[PDB]
Design a protein around this ligand. Sequence first.
Ligand SMILES: Cc1cc2nc3c(=O)[nH]c(=O)nc-3n(C[C@H](O)[C@H](O)[C@H](O)COP(=O)(O)O)c2cc1C
Ligand SMILES: Cc1cc2nc3c(=O)[nH]c(=O)nc-3n(C[C@H](O)[C@H](O)[C@H](O)COP(=O)(O)O)c2cc1C
Ligand SMILES: Nc1ncnc2c1ncn2[C@@H]1O[C@H](COP(=O)(O)OP(=O)(O)OP(=O)(O)O)[C@@H](O)[C@H]1O
Ligand SMILES: Nc1ncnc2c1ncn2[C@@H]1O[C@H](COP(=O)(O)OP(=O)(O)OP(=O)(O)O)[C@@H](O)[C@H]1O
Ligand SMILES: [Mg+2]
Ligand SMILES: [Mg+2]
Ligand SMILES: [Mg+2]
Ligand SMILES: [Mg+2]
Lengths: 350, 350
Amino acid sequence: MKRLTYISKFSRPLSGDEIEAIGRISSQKNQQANVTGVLLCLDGIFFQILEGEAEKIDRIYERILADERHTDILCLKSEVEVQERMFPDWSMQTINLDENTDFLIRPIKVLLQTLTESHRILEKYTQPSIFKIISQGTNPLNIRPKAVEKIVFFSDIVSFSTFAEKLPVEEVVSVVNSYFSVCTAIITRQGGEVTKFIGDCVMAYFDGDCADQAIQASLDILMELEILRNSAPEGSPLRVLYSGIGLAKGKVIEGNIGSELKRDYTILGDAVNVAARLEALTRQLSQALVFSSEVKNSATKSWNFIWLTDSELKGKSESIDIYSIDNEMTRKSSGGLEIARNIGHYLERV
Amino acid sequence: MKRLTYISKFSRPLSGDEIEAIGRISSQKNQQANVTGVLLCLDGIFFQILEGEAEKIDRIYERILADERHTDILCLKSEVEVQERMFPDWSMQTINLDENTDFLIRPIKVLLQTLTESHRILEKYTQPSIFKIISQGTNPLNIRPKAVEKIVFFSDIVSFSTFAEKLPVEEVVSVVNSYFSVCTAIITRQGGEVTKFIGDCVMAYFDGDCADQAIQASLDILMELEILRNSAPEGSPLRVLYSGIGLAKGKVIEGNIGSELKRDYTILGDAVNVAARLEALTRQLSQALVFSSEVKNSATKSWNFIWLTDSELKGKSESIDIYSIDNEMTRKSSGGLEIARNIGHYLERV
Ligand SMILES: Cc1cc2nc3c(=O)[nH]c(=O)nc-3n(C[C@H](O)[C@H](O)[C@H](O)COP(=O)(O)O)c2cc1C
Ligand SMILES: Cc1cc2nc3c(=O)[nH]c(=O)nc-3n(C[C@H](O)[C@H](O)[C@H](O)COP(=O)(O)O)c2cc1C
Ligand SMILES: Nc1ncnc2c1ncn2[C@@H]1O[C@H](COP(=O)(O)OP(=O)(O)OP(=O)(O)O)[C@@H](O)[C@H]1O
Ligand SMILES: Nc1ncnc2c1ncn2[C@@H]1O[C@H](COP(=O)(O)OP(=O)(O)OP(=O)(O)O)[C@@H](O)[C@H]1O
Ligand SMILES: [Mg+2]
Ligand SMILES: [Mg+2]
Ligand SMILES: [Mg+2]
Ligand SMILES: [Mg+2]
């Protein structure tokens, strides 16, 4: 048996009668599927527990995810190998706590609402990967550190300091947040983890055998930024949003790193400095994407690699062969330094 | 009227009779103080709401904070200017939810326990400054970005890469976490905010008129690390834990920066790169603390300033006069580079 617990937000005001109707239809369908559970609502939040055979639960959950009446759905707990039902008599019991005025329920209602409001704010400041660990029954704070091979991804906005000097503060934050949204969506789609934002820079990582996905994510980010620049409104600062990207591979420490007050689940190791140094090299090259030979040698697809004769690294141990991809993007550029001049002239005049 | 809502963890197993006795004594004292509220417990967690005149609530709360029977106390909500009691008939009503088996309470119990467990994990990955904003009734996600003057603090471990190469992974993480705990405790004590960990580096900030506190925090960190090095056990890697510190002042953007998936409440601006560049300069100087003339000129105490003739910055706009403090610490050092050699020889032999 499987049991799922999730919370969600009303997409729109729902009357008491609409909530009842959801419970009625839910009861009718769940009974046929030998599914049981409970549905609670409180001040625009749904809480639901569903239990039954895993095959049936998975299908019902997918349907519920498509329901336009709620949004921001977060699974808090996914129990598998369950051997005893919690709510055996309830195909779907619906409890509208807004309408309840029992005396002993009152203080529990207040606490649940206060905790939920706080939880839903903290979710926005937490990486989603933490939630999947929690939902599976593991406390991420107890994960022991391990050494593991990763592909490290660094991307950094070109000449961001210019934006900050020429634009109102709200517009500056809008540009950087737009950049982070573009990169996060594509990295996550390719199976990477965005682990930290460092000013105008994205730090992410992929599994050590996922060089092909790291390369593809990088190429797709560069293409998305070109579309964004070309399709932005007249006078928009997004027209001069450019990035570099550097990739490196190596053994890093993955674990909980920080103080008693605040920790991060993240990585530590030399491959991080190598990726950051390679990203910085793009300011001196025509190419916006650079990566080390270890990344090139770990790829399995027949990428259009180009070997670059600009291995002037610093801080390394024995230098590094540098590669890029030769396509329409990394080829037709004004290079770096020329781009930085272009950004200042454009922003001076808007 | 004031109303406080907090959660805490049992410091030790408490029997049902001990919880009742807490409620009895609480009832007797609260009645005299015209305080009302409710006390709930569930699987080793306390939840309490207290309401009454602010003067009385503050005193009672301080006493409760000293009670050895609970720990990890977090105030979730602090309401001031309250005009109506929630629980007027209850000096302190005690509800042991572990012992309750009402039927309708059952699903609420499960949700509350699931949400609380998740909340308490997320607290460890969140900066405490976020919680104080929430508890005051403000949603930090809705704070608009603003330009503000700050003192930016950077500190970075000397030759950390050596630790990572020579020690088992668990010991490496122990060293960096010990360093972060030392810095966080002192920065917070002096009114600073630790905003990000970047590998082996602490990024923090102070209000723009708090140069004296930023300097004092830096000096106290250097003194604490010397005590730690001298008092560590034979063979401990903490014996060769050294740091640099750089401070700079300038106008930065403070606000929510990130993606729809994850954001940070943090700062952005040129003063950050200046502080990071100054910290890096300590590797070439005998001094472990460097700061810009804007920090020196904003201090109000008669510090023992020394003007350093090593202003060879890069990436700035018009260079920078560099200062330190001339005391026993910044004076008697082997300088940088010499320290890096010392660390490798020591760790090679343990
Ligand atoms: C919070 C919420 C919870 C729901 N829970 C269930 C459920 O447990 N079982 C179910 O069949 N439908 C549930 N639904 C409804 C489905 O999303 C969908 O409307 C319904 O299954 C379609 O039924 P129909 O195709 O027979 O019209 C829920 C909807 C919402 C907004
Ligand atoms: C969760 C918890 C909640 C408490 N709540 C109250 C309260 O509301 N009012 C109160 O006077 N003491 C409360 N106490 C007890 C105080 O910490 C302290 O033991 C008590 O006030 C001392 O009483 P006495 O000095 O008369 O012996 C609480 C203790 C715990 C562990
Ligand atoms: N060493 C650093 N550590 C942390 N954050 C930094 C560091 N250097 C810069 N930043 C952050 O990044 C922002 C942009 O600085 P950055 O060096 O990327 O300049 P830029 O104008 O974007 O130029 P470039 O094209 O070289 O990236 C700074 O405002 C600061 O917020
Ligand atoms: N540019 C960077 N951005 C983010 N994290 C970095 C960067 N460079 C290094 N790190 C992180 O910091 C860790 C330590 O690198 P660092 O440059 O501090 O070397 P070090 O051996 O401690 O020497 P130093 O005395 O110069 O600080 C690296 O393992 C990586 O986790
Ligand atoms: Mg940049
Ligand atoms: Mg940057
Ligand atoms: Mg270091
Ligand atoms: Mg570092």
